[PDB]
Design a protein around this ligand. Structure first.
Ligand SMILES: OC[C@H]1O[C@@H](O[C@@H]2[C@@H](O)[C@H](O[C@@H]3[C@@H](O)[C@H](O)O[C@H](CO)[C@H]3O)O[C@H](CO)[C@H]2O)[C@H](O)[C@@H](O)[C@@H]1O
Length: 165
């Protein structure tokens, strides 16, 4: 039931990782622009940790064996920063990989993470491969969303409609 596509507030039994930043499903406080029909959204509370992530353990792995390698997600920010969508190590040990895009800071933005242009996630002692291009082809059950990737911005942000296409 906690599988893509994720639209929060449908009595979703979400599962977060041990080190996840606070997350909770809240009535949409910005029923505005691109997300005006959404009545419930995900409230992400950054604490100002440099690489702090919202981490979900999915009931069903995302399958990247096909040509549908693009994850889209609505994100609300009034601050311009980088957003990272990260696949942690897959079900079969598939390499952790990520796409970094910009949020222009204009409230609700549809961000597009095309894993055709993914790179190897930082792993300690893997200098040769860290940040090298990579296209996932495997099954990934653990996803990590970084608001203000590599920055220290703290505060409440909103997230909804994580989908594969
Ligand atoms: O990539 C440049 C930079 O990367 C740093 O490594 C971070 C990882 O530490 C981070 O790991 C996440 C945790 O910080 C978070 O709290 O939990 C989740 C899962 O439990 C982790 O994925 O992930 C990001 C993105 O892949 C990495 O960049 C290096 O430590 C640093 O030396 C390097 O400069």
């Amino acid at each position: 039931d906690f599988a893509l596509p994720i639209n929060f507030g449908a009595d979703i039994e979400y599962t977060t990782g041990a080190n996840s930043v606070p997350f909770e499903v809240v009535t949409n406080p910005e029923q505005s622009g691109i997300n005006a029909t959404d009545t419930k959204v995900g409230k992400v509370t950054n604490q100002g940790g440099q690489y702090e992530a919202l981490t979900f353990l999915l009931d069903e792995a995302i399958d990247f064996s096909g040509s549908n390698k693009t994850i889209t997600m609505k994100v609300y920010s009034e601050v311009a920063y980088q957003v990272l969508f990260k696949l942690e190590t897959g079900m079969n040990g598939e390499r952790a990989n990520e796409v970094e895009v910009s949020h222009s800071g204009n409230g609700w933005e549809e961000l597009s993470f095309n894993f055709n242009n993914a790179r190897n996630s930082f792993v300690q002692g893997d200098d040769a491969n860290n940040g090298q291009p990579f296209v996932p082809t495997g099954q990934y059950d653990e996803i990590s969303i970084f608001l203000d990737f590599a920055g220290f911005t703290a505060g409440d942000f909103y997230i909804d409609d994580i989908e594969q296409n």
